Amino acid sequence: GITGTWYNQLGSTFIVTAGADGALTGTYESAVGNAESRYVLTGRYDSAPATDGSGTALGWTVAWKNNYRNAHSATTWSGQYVGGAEARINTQWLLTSGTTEANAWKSTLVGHDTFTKVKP
Amino acid sequence: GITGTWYNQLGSTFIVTAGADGALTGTYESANAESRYVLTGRYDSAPATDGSGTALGWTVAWKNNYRNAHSATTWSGQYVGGAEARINTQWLLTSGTTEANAWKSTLVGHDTFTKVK
Amino acid sequence: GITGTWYNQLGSTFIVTAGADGALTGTYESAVGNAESRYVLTGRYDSAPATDGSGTALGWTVAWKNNYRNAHSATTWSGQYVGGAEARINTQWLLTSGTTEANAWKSTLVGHDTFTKVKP
Amino acid sequence: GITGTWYNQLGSTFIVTAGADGALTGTYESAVGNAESRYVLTGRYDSAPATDGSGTALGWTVAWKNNYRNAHSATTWSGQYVGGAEARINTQWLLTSGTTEANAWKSTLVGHDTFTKVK
């Protein structure tokens, strides 16, 4: 299932637990950006997905502050878990930095990450 | 500043508690009990005091005890304080799909939340 | 109609002609970023929209190179024209910079611009 | 290196010409290539990219109307071209459908496409 240790295409490590209530909890370690060591993540997933072959919708957030660094920014990943021999979580993400109003136009980066339970 | 009730531009409301450890927890109401959903996210608990906003994000999976849309939305944005406080966000809404339909799985948009209806 | 001079919420100037064949042509002047004066734009729009009250889908691109500056980047706006007493073009945009492979993860900004024929 | 035929991860094809001063013009079609699947594309690219190893920024639009069909929608692709023996155009896209104002919240899909010179 969703619970386990995942890696994206760039080597970031996503350690997550999916609870019966639809909760996601865990830690994220980023291979890119103004980040070091582990950061808390929380999110939600559909705990009763369809039975027609569709994936399981989910999302989570990391605020890029821990006991060692603060980048004044947060990323959300939105996507779906696809089961099978090679389980996969396919996502698109938004990374918003705190900015002044004059700089808000350049506050948000966008991209896509794919996660598997094997390293890239 | 973040803790409390917020209203978007389209008739949605949420109530959130911003914890001292960076947690966001609360309830999102898209329009009655049947429209209330759990929300969970994170925010920068030590933002700059230089005029910059406070970065944050949260997720709602659209399942409750009454309904299930097999989908989830994430909002990514920043809180801006003061007399006209705002949470300015962009969002991604992913639906569970088959592989053949995955190309059309994700909608994108924006929401602005205020403390006054 | 779409043809005319439009302004976004930041005061950028969008001068566009919508041709009978679905073509958009014109110039863009940005209120923000590494930009000076007018840049070429081209795009497309639905020249026969639905008659059920729906807006008119459209999109356009600016590469941020002109005779004065080159930011090595390009923005695409995707949206729809909404007729009314206060005509409006509502868009979401992607701004991709040319980067190295190691920096590609942070190559693309995302935002939303709304245009009217009156300057705010 | 941009001019020619490109193929995405899901079968789609485009034939583009990159003009000297930054114009992109061409046709976007399905893998089958029948006339009913072909649409005009136009866009722009950086005609003087950096020389430090960075990609070439570009974008283009297709409105999904041709002489045969009209889906009342348009897609923009924003990305960069990377040359070499394994040349690529790496993009993210936005697909906006015409909607009423009440449905505007669900008007815009987002995704990503990677284009290569071989199928």
From Swiss-Prot, chains A, C:
Main subcellular localisation: secreted
Taxonomic placement: Bacteria, Bacillati, Actinomycetota, Actinomycetes, Kitasatosporales
One term under GO cellular component: extracellular region
Name the record gives this protein: Streptavidin
GO molecular function term, any single one: biotin binding
KW Transmembrane helix (keyword) present: no
Domain Avidin-like: 1-120
Residue positions binding biotin: 28, 39, 77, 93, 105
Residue numbers of the full-length protein present here: 40 to 159 of 183
Subunit composition and interactions: Homotetramer.
Function of the protein: The biological function of streptavidin is not known. Forms a strong non-covalent specific complex with biotin (one molecule of biotin per subunit of streptavidin).
Keyword annotations from UniProtKB, A to Z: Biotin, Secreted, Signal
Top-level taxon: Bacteria
From Swiss-Prot, chain D:
Source taxon at top rank: Bacteria
Main localization category: secreted
Motif (Cell attachment site): 44-46
Organism ancestry: Bacteria, Bacillati, Actinomycetota, Actinomycetes, Kitasatosporales
Record protein name field: Streptavidin
Keywords, in A-Z order: Biotin, Secreted, Signal
Organism whose genome encodes this protein: Streptomyces avidinii
GO cellular-component term (any): extracellular region
Domain Avidin-like: 1-119
